[PDB]
Design an enzyme around this catalytic site. Sequence first.
Site, PDB file in Angstrom:
ATOM      1  N   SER A 152       0.844  -1.194   0.000  1.00 19.39           N
ATOM      2  CA  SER A 152       0.000   0.000   0.000  1.00 19.39           C
ATOM      3  C   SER A 152       0.888   1.256   0.000  1.00 19.39           C
ATOM      4  O   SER A 152       1.720   1.409  -0.881  1.00 19.39           O
ATOM      5  CB  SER A 152      -0.960  -0.034   1.193  1.00 19.39           C
ATOM      6  OG  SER A 152      -2.174   0.651   0.914  1.00 19.39           O
ATOM      7  N   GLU A 194      -9.071  -6.195  -4.493  1.00 15.95           N
ATOM      8  CA  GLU A 194      -8.497  -5.081  -3.731  1.00 15.95           C
ATOM      9  C   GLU A 194      -9.552  -4.198  -3.085  1.00 15.95           C
ATOM     10  O   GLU A 194      -9.390  -3.762  -1.945  1.00 15.95           O
ATOM     11  CB  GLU A 194      -7.621  -4.222  -4.644  1.00 15.95           C
ATOM     12  CG  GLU A 194      -6.309  -4.900  -5.111  1.00 15.95           C
ATOM     13  CD  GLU A 194      -5.167  -4.704  -4.089  1.00 15.95           C
ATOM     14  OE1 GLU A 194      -4.052  -5.253  -4.296  1.00 15.95           O
ATOM     15  OE2 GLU A 194      -5.395  -3.984  -3.081  1.00 15.95           O
ATOM     16  N   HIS A 250      -7.475  -5.927  -0.419  1.00 17.58           N
ATOM     17  CA  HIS A 250      -6.294  -5.150  -0.076  1.00 17.58           C
ATOM     18  C   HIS A 250      -5.854  -5.479   1.365  1.00 17.58           C
ATOM     19  O   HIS A 250      -6.674  -5.460   2.309  1.00 17.58           O
ATOM     20  CB  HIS A 250      -6.614  -3.650  -0.240  1.00 17.58           C
ATOM     21  CG  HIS A 250      -5.429  -2.739  -0.186  1.00 17.58           C
ATOM     22  ND1 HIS A 250      -4.447  -2.726  -1.156  1.00 17.58           N
ATOM     23  CD2 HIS A 250      -5.098  -1.764   0.698  1.00 17.58           C
ATOM     24  CE1 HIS A 250      -3.545  -1.809  -0.846  1.00 17.58           C
ATOM     25  NE2 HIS A 250      -3.929  -1.199   0.264  1.00 17.58           N
TER      26      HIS A 250
END
Length: 566
Positions: free
Chosen positions: A214, A347, A467
């Site tokens: 990230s 995600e 994610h």
Amino acid sequence: VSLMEKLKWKIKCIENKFLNYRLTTNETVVAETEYGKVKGVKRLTVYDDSYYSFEGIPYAQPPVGELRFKAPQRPTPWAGVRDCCNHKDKSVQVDFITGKVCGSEDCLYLSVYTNNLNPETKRPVLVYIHGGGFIIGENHRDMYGPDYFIKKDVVLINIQYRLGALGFLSLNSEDLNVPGNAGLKDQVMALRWIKNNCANFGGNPDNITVFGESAGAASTHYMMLTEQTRGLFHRGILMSGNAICPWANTQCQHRAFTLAKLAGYKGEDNDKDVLEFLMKAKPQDLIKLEEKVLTLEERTNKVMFPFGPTVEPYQTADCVLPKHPREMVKTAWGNSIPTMMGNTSYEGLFFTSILKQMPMLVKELETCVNFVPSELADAERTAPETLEMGAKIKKAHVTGETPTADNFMDLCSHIYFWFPMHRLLQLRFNHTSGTPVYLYRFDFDSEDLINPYRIMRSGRGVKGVSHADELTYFFWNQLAKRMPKESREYKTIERMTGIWIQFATTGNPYSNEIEGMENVSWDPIEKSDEVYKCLNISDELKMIDVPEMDKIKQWESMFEKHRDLF
Ligand SMILES: *B(O)c1cc(Br)cc(N2CCCC2)c1
């Protein structure tokens, strides 16, 4: 978040401290650094492994008082032995669970881990940079435990760096020396430390791999893009992000005044006077108000964070982003070291909690104009073009006819992760040594073993690979547990840490000795490739065409009349 997860967190925090004590040994040890000697200690894992643990090693002086908002400074050296048997505080941030500000301005530290301080050979050095949108995150082992990695003979290092306003405030005025990107400069100085210090812990300074998920992936990429770090490290892994994701950069130079005014600044919009005020403010005050800085307009144009990495308005000794990240790719030294990139198979599931509280977001998909890349969009998002570009997004993600939440989260996967990846690869290929970039797709779903991010996105009971779901298979965290060694979870941990250590060691992620990978033949992406291939990581390891390819091209077609902007 609900009182119930707050009370459960408190107890899991209560467990994590007793357990942390239980897994120390009375074996203490001492390593030399360039700034002085450090006292580590050996710890155990739930898998009855052991590792030396050095936490709280400063790589900069505390960014306090007059140093706040400034680029980091060399820390002050010491005689004797600095205690590193415990971890320092995290960067000032909003705890997503308590709701309250926690952490400290005194946060610029790294932690070093290795199972053997005197290895027969110099080991590959892996440096992890945590994500959290440049506004949250820690190198504390309750979230980033090195327990899985130290099974294998490597040296793992987790850094901290300043977050939010305190890391990324940016002022237009050259006199004041707050160009911005302090948090990034923390990273640069920490990498400079590792290159000069890993050998002391048994690490080969000529084989260093930097990686992050990230905002840590964005950060790794920045560290590959900036000239400040050339030749510092030798492989890079970008997990679910990079520097040209739209959330990874913002022009925030005007937002310092808004923050001041939220904090009670009385006076005019003047960089000097705003800074003088922000200099005296309580840290917890600025950080808690940070959530109010973005205008309704900004939110509508999908500006994710008020303060983050920025194009600095004037160059300095320590400058890190002299131009836009798309531009910095041109001469990026990092274009020429082995690279691995990847995303999870769903995600956008990450935004579940945000959708819950604002389901009207789904109504944005009826034209999708708000998701058109801002550089192509008009200010009002009313231009006929903007509607036509939006229609392309809508065609790609809206499956029925009244748009759904899933459609929304599916869209998020691309705007924030897959499409920036595409643009990067395509951009990089025109400017590269021919060095290999490899793709993976993390597609392993389980609830038997989770991590705190699942609590933040409300993913309890929720299926799909969100994610940050892959973090579970790399690091110990306080919600984890010892798994049976024949479990699919335990097997993924070995695979993920295996491939990461394999790629770190050799610049090539393939090894026949990793289970499930015997029939894998993992090629990198080539400039001539029409279609990206990726190692899909599920219960089976399988090379496939990136399933997201058709949607990626659909996004790229918005740029049909504006190819120079792609
Ligand atoms: B990764 O560091 C990251 C990416 C996105 Br897009 C959003 C976040 N957030 C949202 C709120 C805090 C974490 C993190």
